[PDB]
Design a protein that fits this description.
The structure is a homodimer of 275-residue chains. Chain A is 75% helix and 0% strand. Chain A is mainly alpha-helical and 275 residues long. Chain A has one domain: Farnesyl Diphosphate Synthase, CATH 1.10.600.10. Chains A and B meet through α10 and α11 of A and α10 and α11 of B. The complex binds the ligand CC(C)=CCC/C(C)=C/CC/C(C)=C/CSP(=O)(O)OP(=O)(O)O (4 copies) and magnesium ion (6 copies). One magnesium ion binds next to α3 of chain A. Chains A, B: One of its GO terms (molecular function) is metal ion binding.
């Protein structure tokens, strides 16, 4: 298909999978918005290989090999996701380094793994979420990447910790645990408690500890918003606040994360306030 | 109750929970057999606290505190398991050190944990299984403990690896994985493969690698049997060969460990051959 229809393919992907990020980045100007769609499609395919694919090691390495060919300028394909990403790399000075780092992060979910410390958690969050922020920065803040980089990495930490805090039960059912073992020990929340899906006072202490780290990272990220160009401030600030609002959503539902999303109306409220 | 009935309480525990070890150690002379029953009851209660209890951290620490009081000679109780173990410590020169080490091993299952390497696996096997061998040695080989110690530790490795190899699916359903991550990577058996309960050629390669380590440890342990007193040779050799036979049982059932036990008749055959 042509470039317009390849980008529209990516528009469908982001709209189907993230009401938050599709709504936030729809507010960007045309070519920046389309580039975000193409970058999102790259991230979605990598994560879905590892989290939903039936042969994730072989499929992720094949994806990595395709990205190598893409970066050499030699990938000949009819895949709309690569057609769109080719244009985005041509149109904006996208840096391949965080794209490779995403793949490093996805490799971390191929085999059994225990998060021991908060440092272990941030290492994982850096490679699977902070890298997304870094992929986007040349589109969102041309010429100002080094100025906003730290806030973008920390926004990744904030969003990934939020994701983890929302998904404790979903991940448990999928035989994954991202809560640090050392905080489980600190607060006296055992593996048997977690397996029993217990929402007790120790769980809440641990959950709030992580949530407060996320809130600190969101605050640090939002402090950098004046350094973005004006046309990126509502998209980035809106994405940040809409995703942060998952935390208070869970609190308002009494920390029940073993069975949470921000309502459509609340997303509109946050976007209006940014605007 | 009196001492005879306290030991009979422990006899019921071992008979209910292990046809293999009850049958093997029933062949010991009277007082050694009864001491093994009491030691088994100690190990069973510790493991069941951690693997079946609803508050395993609090309950295991309370068990540890009771054992501290027991070792000080100050535990006043009507618990038949402690009455029997008091007599066994009085009657044979039992060493408390491996009993404490068991509790260290049980603590390892209180919180999320990933076995990375074979060294990690042997560290775990030492504390939960090798320690049982060490608790028993003053009963099984009085005056000859240092001579047979290494074989007893390695018999622990052999039996625990066998247990793990039989229980991969049972442990997975309980959100535990004891297969080393580095062997999963070596053989290309992913977390998604394991979650999918796939019995493929990579699984079999990994399973056989561990089984061959266990077989080596069984061989080393059995090589020490002539150093045991005559009355312990059939109990120890019988326990070893009956538990080893789980490995070939699984092989004969095509490695299907996601849904295996040695038949009663095969246990009798092994005991007769020892005799
Ligand atoms: C480009 C853009 C604005 C957003 C990209 C969003 C996506 C799809 C990132 C894929 C990698 C991540 C963050 C997985 C989350 S953890 P998990 O274990 O729940 O999976
Ligand atoms: C904008 C900027 C500078 C930094 C933010 C970068 C982004 C969008 C990271 C995405 C983080 C997450 C958790 C995406 C959802 S993956 P899913 O499959 O669970 O949904
Ligand atoms: C005294 C004697 C002869 C035998 C004692 C046997 C017992 C009950 C040992 C308890 C600790 C162990 C080895 C648990 C096995 S691993 P797991 O995770 O399946 O539990
Ligand atoms: C005799 C000697 C010198 C060494 C052997 C020591 C023993 C008996 C170790 C027990 C090992 C296991 C796996 C017991 C079953 S625990 P479960 O609950 O899975 O049954
Ligand atoms: Mg993922
Ligand atoms: Mg995912
Ligand atoms: Mg998630
Ligand atoms: Mg156990
Ligand atoms: Mg057990
Ligand atoms: Mg077991």
């Amino acid at each position: 298909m042509d470039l317009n229809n390849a980008y529209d393919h990516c528009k469908n992907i982001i709209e189907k999978h993230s009401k938050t990020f599709s709504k936030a980045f729809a507010m960007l100007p045309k070519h920046q918005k389309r580039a975000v769609w193409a970058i999102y499609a790259f991230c979605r395919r990598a994560d879905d290989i590892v989290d939903e694919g039936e042969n994730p090691k072989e499929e992720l390495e094949a994806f990595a090999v395709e990205f190598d060919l893409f970066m050499e300028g030699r990938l000949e394909t009819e895949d709309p996701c690569w057609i769109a990403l080719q244009d985005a790399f041509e149109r904006f000075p996208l840096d391949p380094a965080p794209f490779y780092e995403m793949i490093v992060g996805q490799r971390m979910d191929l085999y059994p793994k225990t998060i021991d410390t908060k440092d272990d958690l941030l290492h994982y969050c850096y490679h699977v979420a902070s890298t997304v922020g870094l992929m986007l920065l040349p589109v969102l803040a041309p010429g100002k990447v080094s100025r906003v980089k730290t806030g973008a990495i920390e926004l990744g930490y904030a969003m990934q910790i939020t994701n983890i805090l929302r998904d404790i039960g979903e991940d448990l059912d999928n035989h994954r645990i991202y809560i640090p073992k050392q905080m489980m020990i600190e607060y006296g929340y055992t593996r048997t408690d977690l397996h029993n899906k217990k929402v007790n006072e120790a769980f809440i202490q641990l959950w709030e500890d992580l949530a407060q780290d996320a809130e600190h990272y969101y605050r640090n990220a939002l402090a950098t918003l004046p350094e973005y160009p004006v046309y990126s401030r509502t998209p980035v600030g809106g994405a940040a606040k809409m995703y942060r609002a998952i935390i208070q959503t869970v609190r308002n539902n009494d920390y029940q994360v073993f069975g949470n999303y921000v309502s459509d109306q609340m997303k509109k409220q946050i976007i209006a306030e940014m605007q």
